[PDB]
Nucleic acid binder design. Sequence first.
RNA 1: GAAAUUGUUGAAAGGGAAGGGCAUUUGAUCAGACAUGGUGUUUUGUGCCCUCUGCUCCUUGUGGGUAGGGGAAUCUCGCAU
RNA 2: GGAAUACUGCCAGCUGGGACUGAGGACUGCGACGUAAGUCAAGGAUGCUGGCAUAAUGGUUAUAUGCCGCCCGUCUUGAAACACGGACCAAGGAGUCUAACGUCUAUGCGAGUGUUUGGGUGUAAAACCCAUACGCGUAAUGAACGAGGUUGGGGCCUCGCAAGAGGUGCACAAUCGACCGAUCCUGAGGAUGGAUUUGGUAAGAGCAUAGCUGUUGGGACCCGAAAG
RNA 3: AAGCUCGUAUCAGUUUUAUG
Lengths: 33, 131, 241, 173
Amino acid sequence: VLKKNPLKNKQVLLRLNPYAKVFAAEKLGSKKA
Amino acid sequence: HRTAPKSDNVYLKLLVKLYTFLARRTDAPFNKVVLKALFLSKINRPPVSVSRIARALKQEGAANKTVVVVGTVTDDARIFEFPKTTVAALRFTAGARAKIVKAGGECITLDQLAVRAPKGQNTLILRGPRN
Amino acid sequence: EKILTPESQLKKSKAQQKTAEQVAAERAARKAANKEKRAIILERNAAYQKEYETAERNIIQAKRDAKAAGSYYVEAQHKLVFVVRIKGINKIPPKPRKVLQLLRLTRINSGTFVKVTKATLELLKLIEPYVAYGYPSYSTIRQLVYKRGFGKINKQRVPLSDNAIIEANLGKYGILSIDDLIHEIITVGPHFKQANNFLWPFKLSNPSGGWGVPRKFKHFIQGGSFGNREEFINKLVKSMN
Amino acid sequence: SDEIVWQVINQSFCSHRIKAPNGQNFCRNEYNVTGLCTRQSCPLANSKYATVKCDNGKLYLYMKTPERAHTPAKLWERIKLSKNYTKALQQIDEHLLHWSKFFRHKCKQRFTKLTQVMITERRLALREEERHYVGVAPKVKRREQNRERKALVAAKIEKAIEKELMDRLKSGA
RNA sequence: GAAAUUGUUGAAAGGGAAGGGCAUUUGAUCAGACAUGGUGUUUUGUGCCCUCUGCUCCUUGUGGGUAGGGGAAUCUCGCAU
RNA sequence: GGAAUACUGCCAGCUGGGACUGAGGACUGCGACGUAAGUCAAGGAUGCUGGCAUAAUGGUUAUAUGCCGCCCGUCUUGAAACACGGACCAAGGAGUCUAACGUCUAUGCGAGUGUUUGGGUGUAAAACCCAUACGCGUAAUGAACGAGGUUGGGGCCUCGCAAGAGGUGCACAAUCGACCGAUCCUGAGGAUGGAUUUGGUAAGAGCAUAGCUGUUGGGACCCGAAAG
RNA sequence: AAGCUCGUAUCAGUUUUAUG
């Protein structure tokens, strides 16, 4: 009925791309060479 | 684009709802064809002569297959060796009805055919000449 | 005497029970399949992230080695470009209008992914004045697919909000998740055409910070908006998105 | 058949049909439970029907079956509900055994509405009103206005007051 | 006893005329319950309520209507305080 | 020799200030936390507080004022313009009827159809029935050479979880062809034999009624044109 | 506007390619 926009409201973000939890926990966004 | 019939007959409307229900709850193409034909006008629904039905019955396995006519069945005086088969149509002429009954056959309505063949089991559809 | 239930009611109850048993079995099977597919999607996403990291690291290492060795580096040719309509839907000459319609750019601030080919390059050149395009990055493509990602299902613009929606339509070609669709779009593959067609044309808004130039109707190489902006297209899309 | 009757009463000028401005068709039939002319709501088009009515304070459970369709005289078989909300509802449920959920629910709703309408005794028991709504015809209004003006004109109130004052203070304090 | 139109009174506006629309402040003015309870408890008096004997309708049902003799310390089944 | 900073891009990084929206209406689904029970920001808002019956609040007129708005209708020319009507108001005013020929639509019958020119009858211009006639169609330019064979064909049946494979096929289309009658010749008076094709049958679809509606003639969408 | 055959390979105010 209502579109939940990802990139916010982590709850819906976790529904898609189950690797999001691993990415957040592992801090892969700031990975070092 | 044909959706509904222009006829005001209540019985025709009931037949239309029955056929729509069968088509929507059975996904059988046979019901859809008859439902679409029901909306055809009188000109688009030319009568099917009894002689035409007899000629169509000449195909293999006609005894095990029933004949369904959307329009009205009209008698023909040019044929006398009418086989024994079940004919279903909206209306039957007095002569055609007598010929079918006299030859040992049975005449039924569209609802009777639907209950006897919800998915068109061994059902043959005949369309009369357009012109 | 005791009143007995109607025979029709008894038949209805029996049919309801028999259908409910199958419904419960199907629900259990669906739960198991959902768990398995979630695990599969998780591993696929991990593999895709590792592939992207390895590719970027290899590109950087190759550039550094070429710099050190003194030999020029042969950069890979671009293969994916995002084109966004700039002008309106009026006063457009028929020839550019036909190309724009073929590209599904039927309204301003609308764009779609176009495969890079010798034929498509000519099409982009033909409609160069009325469109702006560049080389989208992974982040921009992901953001677009995540926010304005709408799929075309039986002529209906069904929003993308679950992996099941993509699997039902795009599962024929192996694309069973939004991450798979993003990977296919960014990395052009055998089924790029199907993925692009399935996606509804993007509906983008005006840039949040503005177009940044006093006059849009000019070449980007001279302070304009339209043309071919290699990397600034990402910033333009992010502001618009 | 019910379907033929249902079609004949949907269109073709059913006798009891009210065309409200909202478009809803209201049925004035006394036996109707909802008062609306719709499917499975109109007693005429339904062979099987159930409704709650009351002549005196007692509430009855009127029901109809196809058995008496040939005898309109005694179509309905009313049964007393033994006025009490809980036991009356239990009796209604027992009587409407294997009946449609629609009929049972709406019969219970009608019985509850009628029972709570019995509170009218509260207004009658505690009214002590001193207004008793009175209507005045325009003709009576005219006779109470023009005649009043004529009486005021002929009264000569100022002259009478002056004469009375000139008499009270002319023979004493 | 409708419109155009004319006169008196009340109100408002007006430097070489006006009217309409989006939008707000002001005088004047209008509408603004014949709303008023509900829930479970605690006494008392009744009934369609308890008990004994009855009468009458259909058809006969999981029914309808209606009297005579006794009571509340079983009585919240409803009503009345 | 060594780090830092500027710039670019990323963060499924964190966290404050402001504005509008509250759409759906008992659970069915995708998801997260949690060993579990259970919970959750997970297919749309809930809980609390303050104002109220000599209410809260809302509605109409003008003036108070931020901005905009050329005088209405018909007609010229590609446009605007220009031309003709408009002192104001109450009533009237214009694609309406008929005969014929048609398309579409629905009904009744159906190879038959049309009661009502009239008679019978009648609760009396009302309502019901038709003995014979008559309008239309039912058979082409012997239709069975045989009321035709193949290819497709909406559909039906078999196999197949499906994909698909096989058998049978209305209307309708191509093809193979035949025929009623005859062309173009021939030549036992006109038989026989050659060469092309001819418009259609192969197994009816029409009648009357009713609605919108097209054409023609009647005053013919209304008024107005020198007149014998 | 109604009918039939239908959804495709029916197409393009487009581009390349091929034949020239």
